[PDB]
């Protein structure tokens, strides 16, 4: 019998809120990274942007304050922690990655706070740009591949 | 701490691929819209066609299927979202537009899926015809003007 | 082309001057009406006096003459013309008013010359007493609320 | 025509409020310092405490916050600026003073911020102890003597 304590805390004072999300039960549904349909072996880098579940556009984070606030954005490694989509039925995997800029260069490194700014009376967008490498080796099995990345807007 | 979910998806079954592109790092380099050299004030509409980065000709989209597939083409508004080329050093801008037909009539409207057909055993070309209005007012500063339009072949 | 005339005039002879002001560029900075810090919903009437920008005390108007001079004081309605402070970022407003006497009774009516006396070898103070009504309804958003009342010492 | 600017400000964020007051029109009525009845020449120091206009007891200042807040209290010199009560009809004056502690030692010096503490979930009382010197010289005229001290709770 090892009984222990867990201090719970919350500082209600002046915070920042994330728009574009829908409450799926008790977990915020931020959006979808829909690469679309594809064949077994694709030569072009499959690429799609996150579509917020609430509006359809990009996640719009706004801060409830007057002065500028510097908030951070961190995305985790997905269900299996290595950013791989898994086929619903078979065990095939599809490696992918999420970048922050339009040219697939600034990668949202696993469990890292990619910095962000937010200004007076405005909603800043959180671009989560997906990208998949060209698979020109083995044709992955037919079906639907999925993953649930947990995006962590933290301060 | 606002943690949220982003569902990632990919339907590997029977897709369409875009030829004529080169993988620039992790972003597909589709081509170049080279208007060429010009003077400060041009009276003629400057006009050039996209040159695929892989072959030099037009982007050739082919679909990996037997039955005809109807795929769409969407081009965005460029780096600044208003189709303006920017001088590398100064802040001068050069407004332009991309059309689909040879007579500069069917405009690729910003973020719009201009429809396209593709047939059995064939590669369909994606004509991205550039066009710039005659500037007979103020002479833009010397140098190189650039823009990076993101073409979005989606299904 | 409607060209018209604007007669400019100035009577240099024997005038009155306002002390306690600092020249902000080409506009006389008379002072500050600092109500201080407050919570979303205040039950007490928030009340503060003008603090001259030059000395810190009350605006001291003196007249350059020997015989008594009767000069007037007029304050306008603020930036939006209805005496409301505006949040720097959001569009929330905070209604207020400026009175002349210590008991918040003699109101400086919008664009009205509240009379004043000035005597031999003396500086008369211009009490601009601010007052804000008790807001016990809706909590205004966090941040800084501002307004710039133009005080018009005229003869 | 000397037109000038008066910057108005208010920081709505997390403030402190004063209880025990009643809004007399647009001016907070804090209380009454009632020395009571007296004869022309009194040998004993006349002494009474402030009675809040809202409850009848002492002014109870509470701060709308969790952590302790250090607020200040400043009282001015009365209507004539020398702490003298004036007869309603005649010009006789009665010098007095307001102290902070029960032994008439810690004087609320004119226009001075006598410091104060306020703690979690509590209302701190503001003791305004009045005191009048023994007049054993000239008998002041009959009638009612009054004064209106402006108490300034500031942060």
How does B38-72 read in b/e, with b if 16+ C-beta sit within 10 Å? eeeebeeebeebbbbbbeeebbbbbbeeeeebebe
At A77 the three-state DSSP class reads coil
**Rounded Cα gap, residues C86 and C88, in angstroms:** 6
**Nearest residue, CB atoms, D5 vs list C39, C150, C155:** C150
Closest CA to B108 of B98, B94, B95, B93: B98
How far is residue D146 CA from its own chain's centroid? 13
Are B8 and A85 a contacting pair, CB within 8 Å? Answer: yes
Residues 6+ apart with CB under 8 A from A16: A61, A62, A63, A64, A65, A69, A71, A118, A153, A155, B2
Could C145 and D27 be called an inter-chain contact, meaning their C-beta atoms sit closer than 8 Å? no
Name every chain D residue with its beta carbon within 8 A of the beta carbon of C90.
none
Token pair in block for residue D155: 């942060």
Give residue D92's Cα distance to chain centre. Answer: 22
Pure H helices in A96-142: none
Chains in touch with B (≥3 Cβ pairs < 8 A) = A
Resolution to one decimal, Å = 7.6
Cβ–Cβ below 8 Å for C30 and D4: yes
CA distance readout (Å), A104 to A99, A128, A133, B7, C108: 5, 10, 11, 19, 62
Tell me which residues of chain B have a C-beta less than 8 Å from any C-beta of chain A. 1-18, 21, 23-28, 64, 148, 150, 154-155
- Residues of chain A contacting B3 with CB distance shorter than 8 Å: 28, 150-154
**CB nearest to D12's CB, from C99, C142, C151:** C142
> By the 8 A CB rule, do A71 and A16 touch?
yes
Query: Which two tokens mark D93?
Result: 């004056």
CB pairs under 8 A, 24+ apart, for B94-97? B94/B132, B94/B135, B94/B140, B94/B145, B95/B132, B95/B133, B96/B35, B96/B130, B96/B131, B96/B132, B96/B133, B96/B147, B97/B130, B97/B131, B97/B132
Experimental technique used to determine this entry: cryo-EM
C143 to chain A nearest CA, in Å? 5
Residues of chain A with C-beta less than 8 angstroms from the C-beta of C90: 66, 121
Q: Shortest Cα distance from A107 to chain B (angstroms)? A: 11
Kindly determine whether residue D17 and residue C34, on different chains, have CB atoms separated by under 8 Å: no
HSE of C142 in the Cβ direction (CA atoms, 13 Å)? 14
Query: C52 is written with which tokens?
Result: 């001259």
Integer Cα distance of D128 and D133 in angstroms: 16
Residue A116 CB neighbour total at 10 angstroms: 18
Per-residue tokens: B106: 């069917």
D6: Cβ contacts below 8 Å, ≥ 6 apart: C30, C31, C32, C33, C50, C75, C128, C148, C149, C150, C151
Angle at A117 (CA atoms; ends A112, A118), nearest 5 degrees = 130
Write out the two tokens for A65. Answer: 């304050």
Q: Which two tokens stand for residue D15?
A: 């403030």
Residues in C closer than 8 angstroms to A67, CB to CB, are 89, 143
D8, with CB counted inside 10 A (0-12, 13-18, 19+), is buried
Give CA–CA dist C47/C97, Å, rounded.
Answer: 10
Looking at beta carbons, which residues of chain D come within 8 Å of C47?
A: 27-28
Give the CA radius of gyration of chain B: 18
> Strands D84-87, A123-126: parallel, antiparallel or unpaired by DSSP?
unpaired
């Amino acid at each position: 019998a090892v009984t222990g304590q867990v201090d719970v805390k919350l500082n209600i004072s002046t915070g920042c809120t994330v728009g574009g999300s829908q409450t799926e039960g008790n977990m915020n549904k931020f959006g979808t990274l829909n690469f679309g349909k594809t064949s077994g072996t694709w030569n072009n880098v499959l690429t799609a942007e996150v579509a917020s579940a609430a509006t359809g556009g990009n996640i719009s984070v706004t801060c409830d304050g007057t002065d500028p606030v510097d908030f951070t954005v961190a995305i985790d490694g997905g269900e299996r922690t290595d950013r791989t989509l898994k086929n619903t039925a078979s065990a095939d995997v599809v490696a992918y990655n999420v970048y922050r800029d339009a040219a697939r260069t600034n990668l949202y490194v696993v469990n890292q706070p990619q910095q962000f700014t937010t200004v007076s009376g405005q909603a800043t967008a959180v671009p989560i740009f997906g990208a998949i490498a060209p698979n020109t080796g083995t044709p992955k099995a037919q079906g639907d591949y999925k993953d649930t990345l947990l995006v962590t807007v933290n301060f």
